[PDB]
Design brief:
homodimer, 196 residues, alpha/beta, D-Maltodextrin-Binding Protein, domain 2, 2 domains, 7-stranded mixed β-sheet, 7 helices, DNA-binding transcription factor activity (chain A), Nitrogen assimilation transcriptional activator (chain A)
């Protein structure tokens, strides 16, 4: 049993290649990949429930930075804001959003941005999965701010539109303990992740 | 003010239209919808953290004192594979072949996990559970890699059917019953009653 906590974006963006390479190299180790908010991801690591966590930065501990990536806008196709090539902040600020629930970094990222802007954040509706995000935004009322790697399926959905912003960025990091890296399959997954 | 728990299939199937009618009818109400495995969805209902839950039937829902229970739909279990998976060749996949391939599965606390483990026990075939996962996005992401196949409820395959990199097939059945559950005290509260009403009159279709 190799147990992993990971940001929702990773199992439909870059992780599956790593999962496959690992299983090839350790055939008898069952993988467990639990998609979680960063904050919960660190709890369950501390509790010994996972061996490794891939989380954001709003939140003997070995950390490695993996990448940065912009935040973009998700929209119903033919939402007014889909008219822009790049969506200006003054327009975006006007429209109600779907948001992540508490314990997700992106949530604390979107709050922080709107605090600095001094524009009121209109949080119609809270969700906890990327599917829910797409399902809601499809319905045409609400828009969502989401990291680029979360929007892979979104870009190919003709019901939806994805747009860069006129920047707002997040960093994704990998996190474990030192004693854990003395375990070769864990170490191997750690190096696999960065290897590719 | 209104907190919903729901199995993953709902927010990519029948629930987003209900959310939309609900926010327009009660605009000052903050809606939270948390996608969860059935066990946790019920824990959080019992504990007052959500106001109602849509869950996979566990066969005991009416044993609770204050319970009201609405059956929404029954549905088949179907197979998910990569487009170019050998099993994609069939129109209706037979169990005798399907049993021979390593699977992605749900982890602990999902009704779908037991449904699948028990079936395999009952078939005297051994489940090869190479990977556990907890969302439909992960199921799709992993299955596009062409090693693993997945047993999923029909309504959990909406986006998979529109993805040319994936194949969805019926089996040659396994079914599940999705139900909505709350306590009778909560249905005295107007927005919970309204949400209850919207679901019963729209989630089935």
């Amino acid at each position: 049993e190799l147990c992993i906590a990971a940001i929702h974006s990773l199992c439909g963006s870059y992780l599956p290649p790593v999962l496959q390479k690992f299983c090839r190299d350790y055939p008898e180790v069952q993988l467990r990949v639990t998609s979680l908010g960063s904050d919960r991801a660190l709890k369950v690591l501390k509790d010994g429930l996972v061996d490794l966590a891939i989380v954001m930065n709003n939140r003997d501990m070995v950390v490695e930075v993996l990448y940065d990536e912009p935040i973009e806008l998700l929209t119903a196709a033919n939402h007014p804001l889909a008219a822009y090539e790049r969506v200006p902040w003054s327009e975006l600020v006007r429209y109600p959003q779907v948001v992540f629930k508490d314990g997700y970094g992106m949530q604390r990222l979107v709050q922080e941005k709107f605090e600095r802007l001094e524009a009121t954040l209109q949080a119609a509706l809270e969700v906890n999965t990327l599917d829910a995000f797409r399902g809601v935004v499809r319905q045409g009322e609400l828009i969502a701010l989401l990291p680029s790697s979360a929007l892979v399926e979104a870009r190919l959905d003709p019901t939806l539109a994805v747009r860069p912003l006129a920047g707002l960025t997040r960093r994704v990091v990998m996190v474990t303990t030192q004693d854990r890296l003395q375990i070769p399959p864990i170490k191997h997954f750690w190096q696999l992740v960065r290897e590719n």
